[PDB]
Structure 1
Amino acid sequence: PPIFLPPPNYLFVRDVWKSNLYSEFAVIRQLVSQYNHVSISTEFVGSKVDYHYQTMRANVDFLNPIQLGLSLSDANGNKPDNGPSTWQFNFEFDPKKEIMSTESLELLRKSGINFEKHENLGIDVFEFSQLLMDSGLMMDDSVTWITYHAAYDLGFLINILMNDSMPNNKEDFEWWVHQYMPNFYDLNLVYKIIQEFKNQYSLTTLADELGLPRFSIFTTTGGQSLLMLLSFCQLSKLSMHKFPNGTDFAKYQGVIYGIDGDQ
């Protein structure tokens, strides 16, 4: 597979804590009109379609975000030559909340998580959601959201963006999601149906096939949003946004739980 190496400065992730939360959102705010494609990734500490939704609904208000990544670029994957284009928001964490197993906590450790920094400089999730609401990224179809295994990320996003009044059924959940993100794609789904037309579906195997080096920055939460966006824009470019049968990717815009008829 030909090597795909994006310009070096595209592979930089700016860490965000309570100290630079507002200034970073000020930068996001002025870049979005041009770099209108936004990818998101998350890290939580803690019919088949109706099962997935019910499993998610029963878990969202008990799952607490520790990290969240956002990456911005235009439709062709171009990014600003100066300054950060990917952010890793680190949220506040309570050193005494007895909500985890040592397997998970030790797992997180390796993943590059300093709990002490989260306890003393972690950002407040409500403050973050408020900044996200007014950033210009929500409720605007000129902005395209990119996700991988949406359901849970969006579930969470919607959960914080709203009055914690989570919807009560799949149908109403989808309604709210389309209202906050009128233009979005689940890259995992786009790839699954592509890599199902020629016959793994992980972001990693997708990135390999596109020939993206296994840079370690890609292993962090911020790096993940970055890998996601790079992959979306490249896969899209090589495919002139078409599926192996000529169909346009748009056919799957807004699809979380499967296209109408395959649910």
Structure 2
Amino acid sequence: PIFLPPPNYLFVRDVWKSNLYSEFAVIRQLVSQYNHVSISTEFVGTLARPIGTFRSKVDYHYQTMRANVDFLNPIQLGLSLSDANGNKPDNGPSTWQFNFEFDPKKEIMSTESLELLRKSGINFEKHENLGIDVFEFSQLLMDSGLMMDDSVTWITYHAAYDLGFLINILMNDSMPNNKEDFEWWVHQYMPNFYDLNLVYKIIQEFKNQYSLTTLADELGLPRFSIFTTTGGQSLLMLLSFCQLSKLSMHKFPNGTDFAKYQGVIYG
């Protein structure tokens, strides 16, 4: 089975300080018609480890994440919109990659992962000078009409961190003590969303890693260089989610809706 999205679908637009507002205008326009938005992020993942007590492995997972979202800043964030069937405007960019202002010298990093990230294709000069200011960003994203609307559907893959950074950016405050509050915030800010990684897990588990590229390969998509970018990442997870939700009419093999695992994090 070969799945070959229309060429314009594969176009990812770099956003910098310079073009932030225009792109956000476009976004603001498309969101009504294309109500599925998918998110990806890129950071050092240099994780500090919290020590002490907590509670089950989730309170530990949460605690670690919290600590890290707090101590770290995302270098890049991808976004992608499409309609529920995974259609995108035949005209103009439907996928953005926002590049935040990130100074290696001023932020947590190891020449190790600095060089690994340069190989990844991050240009730290551009990010230093031309980088988006996350305050501006958070502000545009607030009234854009993606957040806080049952109408919009958010799509994420292995979301703990990605949703962490996002909610952190929106809150403009230190992440909460506990998973519970963090979740009140997630559900407030994004009332409708799916973790593709969990839906896929569950699916693969009838007829029984889960890496997105596996889901992608089974779905038929070629491996285009573009998919490795952060933006590309959001693209891929959106194409994959939409295709998969079409095939199965968002029903699991057993006839219960994907909607059961709406709101459900991790994977």
TM-score by length of 1: 0.95
Percent identity (aligned) = 100
* Structure 1 residue 163: Cα displacement: 3.2
* Structure 1 residue 155: Cα displacement: 1.1
User: Deviations along 1:209-256, whole A, 9 cap, x unmatched?
Assistant: 101000000000000000000000001111111111111000011011
* Counterparts of 2:166 and 2:13, CA distance in 1: 21
* Counterparts of 2:107 and 2:19, CA distance in 1: 29
User: What is the root-mean-square deviation in Å for CA atoms of aligned residues?
Assistant: 1.0
* Structure 1 residue 160: Cα displacement: 1.3
* Counterparts of 1:24 and 1:129, CA distance in 2: 14
* Counterparts of 1:194 and 1:232, CA distance in 2: 12
The ranges of structure 1 where at least 4 consecutive aligned residues each deviate by more than 3 angstroms after the TM superposition are none
* Structure 1 residue 201: Cα displacement: 0.8
* Counterparts of 2:134 and 2:189, CA distance in 1: 18
SS at match of 1:54: helix
* Counterparts of 1:104 and 1:64, CA distance in 2: 14
User: Deviations along 1:110-145, whole A, 9 cap, x unmatched?
Assistant: 111111111110111111011111110001000000
The alignment of Structure 1 onto Structure 2 pairs a total of residues equal to: 255
* Counterparts of 1:223 and 1:156, CA distance in 2: 18
Residue 114 in 1 paired to residue 123 in 2? yes
Gaps of 5+ in 2: 45-55
* Counterparts of 1:71 and 1:163, CA distance in 2: 23
Alignment correspondent of 2:27: 28
* Counterparts of 1:163 and 1:69, CA distance in 2: 19
* Structure 1 residue 98: Cα displacement: 5.5
* Counterparts of 2:2 and 2:198, CA distance in 1: 24
* Counterparts of 1:82 and 1:110, CA distance in 2: 32
* Structure 1 residue 102: Cα displacement: 2.0
* Structure 1 residue 103: Cα displacement: 2.1
* Counterparts of 1:65 and 1:157, CA distance in 2: 9
* Counterparts of 1:172 and 1:135, CA distance in 2: 24
User: Deviations along 1:63-86, whole A, 9 cap, x unmatched?
Assistant: 111100000000000000000000
Higher mean alpha-carbon deviation, 214-223 vs 169-178, is at 169-178
* Counterparts of 2:129 and 2:161, CA distance in 1: 27
1:188-203 to 2 correspondence within 5 Å?
A: 188-203=197-212
Contact 2:97/2:231, CA 8 A, preserved across alignment? yes
* Counterparts of 1:83 and 1:240, CA distance in 2: 28
Contact 2:70/2:174, CA 8 A, preserved across alignment? no
* Counterparts of 1:71 and 1:188, CA distance in 2: 17
* Structure 1 residue 99: Cα displacement: 1.9
* Structure 1 residue 95: Cα displacement: 4.0
Q: 1:148 to 1:21 in 2, by over 3 A?
A: same
* Structure 1 residue 149: Cα displacement: 1.0
* Structure 1 residue 175: Cα displacement: 0.8
Contact 2:69/2:175, CA 8 A, preserved across alignment? no
Higher mean alpha-carbon deviation, 166-175 vs 3-12, is at 166-175
Higher mean alpha-carbon deviation, 105-114 vs 213-222, is at 105-114
TM-score by length of 2: 0.93
1:1-263 to 2 correspondence within 5 Å?
A: 2-45=1-44, 47-97=56-106, 99-257=108-266
Q: 1:95 to 1:163 in 2, by over 3 A?
A: closer
* Structure 1 residue 105: Cα displacement: 1.0
* Counterparts of 1:105 and 1:217, CA distance in 2: 21
* Counterparts of 1:98 and 1:40, CA distance in 2: 23
Gaps of 5+ in 1: 258-263
Contact 2:72/2:108, CA 8 A, preserved across alignment? no
